[PDB]
Amino acid sequence: KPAVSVLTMFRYAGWLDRLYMLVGTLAAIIHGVALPLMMLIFGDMTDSFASVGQVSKQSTQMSEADKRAMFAKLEEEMTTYAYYYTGIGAGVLIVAYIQVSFWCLAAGRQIHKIRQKFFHAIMNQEIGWFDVHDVGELNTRLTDDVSKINEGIGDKIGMFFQAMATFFGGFIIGFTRGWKLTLVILAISPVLGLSAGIWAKILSSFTDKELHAYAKAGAVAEEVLAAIRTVIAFGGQKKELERYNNNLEEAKRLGIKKAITANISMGAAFLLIYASYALAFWYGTSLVISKEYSIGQVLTVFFSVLIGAFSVGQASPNIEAFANARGAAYEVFKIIDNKPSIDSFSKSGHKPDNIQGNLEFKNIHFSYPSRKEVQILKGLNLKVKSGQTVALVGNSGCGKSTTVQLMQRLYDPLDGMVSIDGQDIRTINVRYLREIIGVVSQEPVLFATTIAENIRYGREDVTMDEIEKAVKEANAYDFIMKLPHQFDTLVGERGAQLSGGQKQRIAIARALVRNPKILLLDEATSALDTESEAVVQAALDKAREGRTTIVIAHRLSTVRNADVIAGFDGGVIVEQGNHDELMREKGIYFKLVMTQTPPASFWRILKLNSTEWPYFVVGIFCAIINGGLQPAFSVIFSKVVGVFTNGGPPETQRQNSNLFSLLFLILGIISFITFFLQGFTFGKAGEILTKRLRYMVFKSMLRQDVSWFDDPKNTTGALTTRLANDAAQVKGATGSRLAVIFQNIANLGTGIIISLIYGWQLTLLLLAIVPIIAIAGVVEMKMLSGQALKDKKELEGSGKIATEAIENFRTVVSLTREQKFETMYAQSLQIPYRNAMKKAHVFGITFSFTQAMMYFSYAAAFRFGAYLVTQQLMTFENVLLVFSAIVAGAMAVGQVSSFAPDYAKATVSASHIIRIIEKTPEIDSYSTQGLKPNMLEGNVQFSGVVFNYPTRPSIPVLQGLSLEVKKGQTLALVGSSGCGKSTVVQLLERFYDPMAGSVFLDGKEIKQLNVQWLRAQLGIVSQEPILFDCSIAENIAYGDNSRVVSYEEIVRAAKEANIHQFIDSLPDKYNTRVGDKGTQLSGGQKQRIAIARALVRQPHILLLDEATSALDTESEKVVQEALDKAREGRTCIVIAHRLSTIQNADLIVVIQNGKVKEHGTHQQLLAQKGIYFSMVSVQAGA
């Protein structure tokens, strides 16, 4: 919404840049004007053949007499028109180079200045300006927004003026050559603008319906693939597939309806557009029979107007490119034009010599940019005598850290003054002030260069001697010399990450080359290891003694030797003095001392598509007919002008043009019929395989075991995405792109034959010219993409050192050295600058060539079409036919290169979709094999079980686990932590087979048992029960599948679960909908329902996995009261964390490092004193 003045945007264009754009836009207008003139000559060539075509047939008496005056007229006329033609091609060759080169030249020159001025402006802002902004968005604003500006001031403006030239020039030649046909052509324009306006309303409203249609199926997939362990445990994998298959069945019905209506729309609009033209052209014929327009003049206006009409559309993108570049330049120039109060680039203010360093802070009130919300310094008073070292102490707020901020004048104070020596800080030059102030901050930062360079960031003029004495005076010399490569080592976020106490020591050495008169040490010892803290602290004490120093830390070790100590309370300075006096005061300081003491040939995807042997042959045969039918419109147009030029006697003409215009309309409707058929067949053929694919994928997805769903690669979102994308993509490859790719090869094929058998060698010539201008058009785009990737790689190096400069900014400005990053950025940009100059010459050459190759190609079409061809007993009516046939057949092959990525993007989406079906699990619930024992009573034997999780085979959970539990008794499961308590329940559900050892139930190893039948006897209840969106009766009936559960049966379980108070209280009762779609209830009710579905199954085994995890107050007392009643009649395993509710258990087992450690009844483990006694004691006392 915000934008920029047009002149301010070009403020960096001066002298030559203003000229380049002028010559550029000039040649751009010359370029545009060239085309409607080229079509104007196409009319004069018609009248030459028409004056001879009428007189050649007017004879029927003399033959050799027509070999003289006709051929002479043709000789003088065709050589004239061909000479003019060769002239236009040389013109476009020059102006197209001038057009693109000059504009790209002005673009590159300015963006170089923009980028330099922009980065210079970024470094000029004061710190308060950064505290209110996002540096990441700013740096992306530096590289992205400058690109948008370049796109708008580049050759796009030349294209814009070239287009308006065609538009004006087309309608000038239109109006002058004929004021009637133009008004007629404009009269049908609203119909064309109205038919394509039905497209913007149908697409935008139906693209939502499909994104709404699958959103109903993808919601099933989401709540399924999120609750996968629950459907796996309850075996609803046939139902959850059925529901998805039922929503897939609706999405395909809405997809064929959209296929019916959209193909009805596309054909009807195409028929309206082609009927609109043919009326304007048949109207053209109605004015030649009246001797008011020449048959060649009808063409000149009909082409020039339609050319200029579409030139409007071909200019609209360049308008948006310029406008976006304006609005992109707003926030950029706003930074360049913003002027600071602090500067630091300013050459102003005093530079005191012999600074003795007597600092004082006077009545300083301050607040950081969070402004009226907080005021961190309510008044202040502090002097620090020269040579002395004052220490600032404080409980919190870190108003301590604020004085160092003000002392460098990173901010100016709200009220009061900071005075270095006797002068106010604001009277001294900002840069010189920061140069007489050395800073060592808590988190030290080193830039990605050599140590000597990072030390060189203290002072640019320095020799390895001073670097050596600096690091040796910080006792940082001993440890870097042992490091390889000496001073030439590397540091940064990338490479050679060092110890913190060593980085701080380089920072002290960096600040030491500064030889500052003032020193500020902010928590430089804080947050550092204890051993190296002394190594650095010795350098700090050796860094002072020559300077006046303010130091802030929470280490009361460094503070004793300070000549003065200062305490803060609420931004108010409270206590000050030597260490002993503060202890005698027994105030804030004394208080704190005591406290601290693969693209491949995939045919099988088409073999699945072979489910429909028809519907394809219908469309292909229909598309090839439509292919063969398109050039027949060019044949008609050829003979509507052909018989009109080859007329002779004029009486028969008027009756013939009516017959032709009639047949064309019969051919257009027969094209509409074959277009609605080739679009509906492919549409319905691609919609059913979308169901088959999403069905077979979602089926195979439910086949995999919990091992697969645990993968970080496969999350519920990444699976639904993989589920939607791959299925839609393969529909496109077998969809419209194929029907079109066959219609077009049929369109060229049926066009090439007609042209070949008519004009001999005429076609053989055009087939030499067209593939070259097409390849030359392709190679230009390859060079275009090559130049694009290269410059992206080069400015990336510049923006990389821009990222470093602005992300670590508050440090660089503390060290000054901002001019350094400017020059580095300038040198980095100097390569893309000289690159951008060559770009203009390249872009201009390629564009001018592809334009010249099209115009010279046109000259070859007629100079050969006349002369050698028409000096033969030939037919001009054929030369026009081969032009339209071949050129349109070629431009229809131009659609092959556009649908090429639709094939690759689909094969890649097919690559994953064929493997996701074929991948097989280790535990497949689908296998019907397995024993299915007949004996009811349930035991469980864990024997020597070692288990590791396939995602994390590092820390083991189960090592040699061994349990046993008889029928009808409760096995309590206590654990120090982790899923060692929970993995038991997962292995019994056989979510995994154990690595070593085995687990039996009735004595049969579950590994040889039937996987589904096994889980069918298990009453799993977990921490967070997930309930799908449906009737609670259904969430309950989910406990028993392969059979519909009775109402009184799901009542009995709801009675059992003590949830009946809700189920009757509701208005809908058992038919109420749950799942945060229809209704919402608290967790206690959700769990009771999960208990109900658990025992709707009537299992012989309950599995209560911390069932009271998330619960509170009376809700726990009522849920535990339901679980306690659900067991005692069944085999049970309870890992619940309530050991008070575990007291009445038949056997309590303590898990330790995967081994069983203690086990026995409650009082038995209470008699022993150890882990279980400690577990019961710790949470009964607390």
Ligand SMILES: Brc1ccc(Oc2c(Br)cc(Br)cc2Br)c(Br)c1
């Ligand atoms: Br009659 C007649 C035939 C083709 C005409 O232009 C074309 C041409 Br040329 C090709 C195709 Br496809 C469709 C149309 Br409409 C005109 Br205008 C009038």
